Every structure is written in structure tokens, then in C-alpha cells.
Chain length 260, copies 4
């Protein structure tokens, strides 16, 4: 249990982000959701955290692709909570294309949100944790923060940056009661991944599941998706006392991806 | 959280092997403890696991150093417990000496108990788990499973084998509900380490706790030992449903050892 | 040798840059130097590359902190060399400070040159090399692209990001005859580092060379500095055919830095 | 380049091991080959190297599965060579089978040879190198020393042990002018390999080249085998004054295998 704890998750209005915000809350921590999305959904989910888990759940808007905006975003966050014990850096965007064909504009946005946002966020959370004697910076990289895949230059670089950045955060606060780790996800049955599945399904005349296993075969040996409840659990674990000595390292939930 | 689960931990009569069993027993699993010791203390440690967590605890002596003996051993445990859900391959010894001064005896022993016992124990338990459709193989490796240190050729080579072996186990059972991961601890305050702290405390004319920091300084930036309770905790988490898609990788509780 | 190859090198008017150019040139390839400097020395350096090794040497200026600048740069490089086989991204800058006190000017300035210049520079050379059928992109990363250190969030983030980009580049051009590898150096006795030999020298009362070892002890087990020439050799190595199938990997010359 | 050097390669009467003894010879170093085969075949090769490179070649028959035997083998190698500057541990064996079926004979035979031999061979060559003030230990592992594949437990374990063993050896001798790295090749068109490629060839009716790209496509992106000569060029480069500061690291030649 993380009762009494004050958690903050960026880009947490749906999918991965919203999943961890859910499990942290379910674990007893007060949270702060963030990210763009159809407003009613935002409020509806923010409300559903409060009621279903009996904790405080605030919503603070912020376009993390902006250095300063994100730095103040956490300050407000901490004020809304009356503290800041756990910070989950999730915000992210993607784009597929060969290097020679990769839009410089695209390259900057991914680096800015995927990499930069993590730095500015930590930079602002640390002082509050250092002064408390306890903290947890959990960055959400991916298996791509450990290995690469065709045409994902920007994303892989950024993710590899986050892993490194995770290691300096850990060393700079070693022994101060603060740890920093990165959860490196594998495939997740995400809405648009769900569209990729349908595409291969009706394009080959196969059931949805067979189509699913088809998309997972090149990378996830388990051929089974990593579930949001599992990602949430990983985060809740890192935040556990048992993870007091775990720091600067990665936690891979990729159903076997990197093992080979 | 692991109520009704049957777990077997090798080298569980004290130290880390004892805490992990205790932690799983606290999670509800029945546990089979194994290791050397004065029968009065074994019966004591076994007796409390039982009276304290209301689970069933059985002790099975076995020479993990012999391929055959370790196989009938798991076969015996499966039987005692009435099944086998979680196997923690813990046992192991250490010998420090330069490469060109390393006793072939010590070399062969380190490898037989630290590496081979893992394989024989994995192979004997795997069928039970494969027929059930669910399993948890947890190898207790080390930071030295990922990196080296002067004068530990046998231990480092053995520990790396475990990490390699753990990857093959996970890929061979991908999607079968059987996962294999390797926990990689850093400095752990063992009884032999206490004397080492004691000796350095008097040598440098400084206090005991100041000597602990001094000892961990070169390898563990957190200047804090990973507790046994913490590794049992990591074991529990690995045995959880939140880790169904965490297979063939490493859990590093090393205070930052491998971040630098 | 590499007779007739057309290698380009960023940040090469001095330091490792010039070194690699010298080795690539020493092996008979036509080079192109690029970097800040006094028109005398630079020319004196180019001109000498032309006489000293019997090859063609060109100089090109460019603000690699600018996409278009760096993209227009390798273009000029080619036009001058009449092709382009070996590309080397070396440029980079440093800045030490705890994450929470790291100026955003420095983080952005480091990410843009150390990491973003790699992207763009690569994206402009690939087409050239793609139509040719042979490529060789060498990215000078750092021990800090695999592990971290205190107060180096940006430089470590950027160098990890280059490792990833290296893999993606290699994977994206698999079997095409183009390979991309990242050389990861340990400490190089740079006049900058020399200022650290001396402070440590005057502070502890030890002779200059004993202080050289005291500086390296913390990270480089061989207590010996990596030399600019050695790196140059490694560059020529990756440019040879023996390395035809080494792609997307790291070549560490760190005296055991990453080994422990 | 290696004129006057004394190098030894185990298991080099043919294949990969031979390519290296050959390239080292071409480098100018005298060499000691070893392995299996007919007296007429061995002599034929020992013959050529010597008479086709202006180098002295000696052949020693030693069973490297026996601890005391391999320790005698290098003793005799330095005797016949007049010193020992380069030791290339290459002798290995394989066996494919699921873990619960993997033959204990097989496991012990793989470990003794693929791993234990590398230990003993290194322990006996070091003293000679320690006294010399210069030395080169080049272990030949594989991508299975970094990652894994299904059904190759003993091999992937032993290989991982080597890599770990390679690190210790380097840290134990860093600065002494001696280095130890591990060459990690990917698919090589080896005898044992070739039949897998002809197996699937007539198992789908496709000519080799296609049934082979099958075997490749799963792990090796560049769809091109690693040639023995290339591996030789690598050992030659690891023996150069360029890699004097390259030690305890792995050098991967695997068409992008570990890149993704
Ligand atoms: Ca991999
Ligand atoms: Ca390390
Ligand atoms: Cl890919
Ligand atoms: Cl050490
Ligand atoms: Cl550090
Ligand atoms: Cl496989």
C-alpha cells in the first residue's frame, strides 16, 4: 500500500498512463493526472479514480513539450497534493519512417516530449523529494530504450536517452531515500495497435486473435500482450519498500522481447 | 496474494534463502526449505514458518552439488508439497583468488553449485510446471551476473551463466504461463560481512556504521545493503500476476552498482 | 589501407577529431576536417594532411547545432570529395551539474549537438551512401552511452541516444553494405582533463603522474588514458572489410570501465 | 604488424579457429594450431601457413576437456613458440534440446569445454604474459554470450560464462599491458550449420540460398553469414596497439543481431 502517498503521472488521460494512475490510486496514493483529451473523458476518469479508490484525484493541464510549462506544472501538482512522493514520467508521441525520410519537425517533438519532458520534470520534482528524505522517479521508457527497431530513430534514441537519464538521476541521489528506474514495456494492446490487428486480420481473412499473435511474433516471444494492470503493478512495486535498494536500473515487461 | 501456492527455495535455512521463503510463506504459499544446519535450528525455522503464517513448511536435505541428487530433491519437494508452482534457485558458495591462483577444486565447486544446480533444478521442475500450465522459476544470481569484480572468475562466470540460462528458460516456455527471471543482488549484509565491517571499523579507527559505508563505497553508491526481506519481496512480486509478461530478464536490487 | 575512400569528420580541427582524420588519411583516404579555430592553424592542419599522407584534404565550416547547417554541410563535403564513404560524427560538448541545477541552455545545447547533429548528419549521408551501395557511419559515443555518472544527465542522455540511433541506423540499412557503429571511449588525456590531473595533484600532495592514476582510478581500471590515435585506429578498423558484418554495435576502448 | 609475436589458437585445425590462426600468421606471428583431424590433414595446414606467410607454425594435440591437460597444452605451446603473446580460446561444442530433455552428459561436456577450458587455458598463459609485461587474451564467444535462443541452455550459459570470465581477466590484468576481450560472432556457415540450411532447403523445396535466408532472417538482419576471415581480421585488430586500451569488452560481429 501507498496510503498517504502523493503521486503524479504525466500523459495519464488514457492507456498506459491512466493505468498506472489507477493502480497507484488503488494502492492508496493521491494522484494528479495530466494530458490532452476530450474534456468529459478527462473529468469522468479523474472522477472515477476518486470514487472507486477513495482518494483525491486532481487534473492539471500542461503541454509537456514545453520546458517551462512542465516545470511549473509539477510545482502546481505538488501544491494540489501538499507534497510529491511519486512522479511517473509517461507523456509520449511516435512516428514511423526511415532516417533519410524522417521529418526534422517530427524528430524534435519526440525528443522534446519523450526525452526533454523527463528531464525538466525530474529537475523540478527532486528538490521536493530531497527535502523530504523519500522519493520515487519512475520513467516509462520501453524495450526500445534497450534495443532498436526499423524506422523508429527518434523514439528509440529518446527512449535510450531516458534510460541513461534514469541512471544519472539514480546516482545523483543514491542513499538519499530516492530511487529512479525505468519500466521498459513491450507490446501493449493499445487502441491503434488494435487497429493494426484488425488490418492484418481482415486483410488476411483470419480471426482477431490469430492476427494479434501475428503482429507480436517478430518481437514478443510470449505472443501475449503486456496489460495495463501489469504496468501499474510494476510501478506500485518500484514504489514499495522492498524496492528501496533498486535504483538506476530498468524493469522489462516485454513477454521475452529483449531476452533474445 | 500467493495463498495456495507451493514454493521450493534451495539454500533456505538462513540468510537470503531464509527470508525469501519467509516472504512467500507470508504471501500464503507453502514452502519447502533446504540447506545445511544443526537440526534443532532447521526444525525451529521450519516450525515458525508454519505457526507464524499458518502454512505448511517441510525441510528436505539435499546435496545440490550432485546433478542426480538435486533432481530427486525437487521430485521430493513436489511430492511433499503436493505440486510445485515456484522454484527459487538460491544456493551457492564464493571463493576469491586471482585467476592464475584459483584452485581447480574451488572453480569446479563454484560452477557445480552456483550454475549447474540451477539447470538440473530447472529441468526437473519444468515438467511439473509445464503440465500444470503455470510456473515461476526465480534464479538468485547477482550484480556479478551483469558485471565483474577483480578476483572472482568462478562466481562471475557462474553468475553470468545463470543469466544466460534464465533467458533460455524463459524463451523455451514463452506463453506457457511459466516465467523465468533472475534477481541480481548487490552487497548484502551477511554474517561474514559483519566481521569484515568489524575488522575495518577497528582498522581505520571509525564507527561500525561508518565502516559499512566505507566498505560499500567502491561498488554500491547508495552506501546501504540490500536486505534479505527486500529480496523475498522482489521474489513475491515476480511470482505475482503483475509479472505474467516479465520473463527472461533481470531484477537488480544493487543500490546503483550497475547504473555506473 | 582505404585508398580512394571519402571520409568526412565533424569537430576535427583538433582533439580526437583531427586524430581520426589523420588515421583515416594516414590510410590513404581523402578527408574533410570541420571545426572552430584560427584560419591559420586549421589551414596549417588541412594543408599538412595533404602533404603528409598524399591524399586530398578539404576543410568545411558548419554550425552543426543547426539541422540545415549540418545537412548542407555533409552535402558540401560530398561535392568536395566527389562522393562520400566514411562519415564520422564526433562533435560534442560538456557541462557538469546536479540535474536540478542544470541550465536549460546547456541541456538543449548538448542534446542538439551531441545527439541531434547525429540524426541530421546521418540523414544526409545515407542517400549518398545508399545509391552507392557502400556506407560506413561511425558515431563517437562514450563509455557514458552505456553507463552513467553523477552530474551528467544531458551528456549521458545524449550519448545513450546515440547508441540507440546507431542500432536503428544499422538495422535500417542491414545487408545494404552500409554499417553503423558507435565507438565508446573512456577518459582521454585532454588539456581539459589535465587541469584535473593538477588540481588532484596539488590537493593531495602527489606527483603529477600519481595524480593521473588517482583521477582514472574511479572509472578506468587500467589507470591509463585512451589515446586519440588508438581511437583513430579503431575508426580505420570499422572502415575496413573485416568489419563488413559488424553493424549497430559498440566498440569500447575504456580500459575496463564498462567491464566492472 | 604482429611480426615476431607468438600466438596460440585452440581448436584451429579447421573452421573459424583456422581462419584466425591464418590471419594472425598473415599478420606475421608464429602460431600453434590444435584440434581434431587426420595427421595428413593437420600437417597440410600447418605446412601451408608456415610456407605461405614466412612464419613458424607448430601443431599440438591436446584434449581441452581435461583440466590438467589443457594446462599442459599451453605449457608446450609456449615451449614450441619461445613465448606466448596471444592466446585465442576458440574450441567449442554444441547440442540442441529442450531443457527438461537436455542430456546431463551434454551439459557437463559443453561447460567443461566451452567454459572450463577457457578458464584453465587463461590461468596457464597469464603467468607468462604477466612476466612479459604484454599479452593478448581473445576469447571467442558468440551472440549467445549476450542473448539467448531456444533449446541451447548449456551453450548460452557457457558462452555467458566466458563473457563474464573475460571481464574478470581484464580487470585483474588491466594496466599490465595485457587485455582480454571476447569476440561474439553471429551465424557463421559452419559445418553443423550448413546441414540445417540444407535440411529446410529440401523441406520446403527451396534451393539453399532461400532455405538459408530462413535460418538467417530470424536473428541476423543483414541476411549475410559472418565469414571466418572477417573474424580473423577482428582477432588481428584486438592484437594491435590500437586496442591497447580495449579490454574486458565484447566485440560483436552479427549482422545486427544484438542491435535489435
Ligand atoms: Ca536483443
Ligand atoms: Ca558497469
Ligand atoms: Cl526491426
Ligand atoms: Cl574490481
Ligand atoms: Cl558516479
Ligand atoms: Cl529462439
Amino acid at each position: 500500500m501507498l496510503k498517504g502517498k502523493k503521486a503524479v503521472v504525466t500523459g495519464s488521460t488514457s492507456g498506459i498512463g491512466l493505468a498506472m494512475a489507477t493502480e497507484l490510486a488503488k494502492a492508496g496514493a493521491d494522484v494528479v493526472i495530466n494530458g490532452f483529451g476530450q474534456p468529459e473523458d478527462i473529468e469522468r476518469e479523474r472522477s472515477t479514480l476518486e470514487s472507486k479508490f477513495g482518494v483525491k484525484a486532481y487534473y492539471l493541464n500542461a503541454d509537456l513539450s514545453d520546458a517551462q510549462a512542465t516545470r511549473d506544472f509539477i510545482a502546481k501538482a505538488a501544491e494540489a497534493l501538499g507534497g510529491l512522493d511519486i512522479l511517473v514520467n509517461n507523456a509520449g508521441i511516435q512516428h514511423t519512417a526511415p532516417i533519410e525520410e524522417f521529418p526534422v519537425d517530427k524528430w524534435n517533438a519526440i525528443i522534446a516530449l519523450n526525452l526533454s519532458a523527463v528531464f525538466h520534470g525530474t529537475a523540478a520534482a527532486l528538490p521536493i523529494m530531497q527535502k523530504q528524505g523519500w522519493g520515487r522517479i519512475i520513467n516509462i521508457a520501453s524495450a526500445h530504450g534497450l534495443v532498436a527497431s526499423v524506422n523508429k530513430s527518434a523514439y528509440v534514441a529518446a527512449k535510450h536517452g531516458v534510460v541513461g537519464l534514469t541512471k544519472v538521476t539514480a546516482l545523483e541521489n543514491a542513499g538519499k531515500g530516492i530511487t529512479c528506474n525505468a519500466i521498459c514495456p513491450g507490446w501493449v494492446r493499445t487502441p491503434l495497435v488494435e487497429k493494426q490487428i484488425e488490418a492484418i486480420s481482415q486483410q488476411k481473412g483470419i480471426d482477431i486473435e490469430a492476427a494479434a499473435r501475428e503482429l507480436l511474433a517478430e518481437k514478443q516471444p510470449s505472443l501475449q500482450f503486456v496489460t495495463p494492470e501489469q504496468l501499474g503493478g510494476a510501478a506500485v512495486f518500484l514504489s514499495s519498500a522492498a524496492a528501496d535498494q533498486m535504483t538506476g536500473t530498468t524493469l522489462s515487461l516485454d513477454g521475452g522481447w529483449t531476452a533474445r
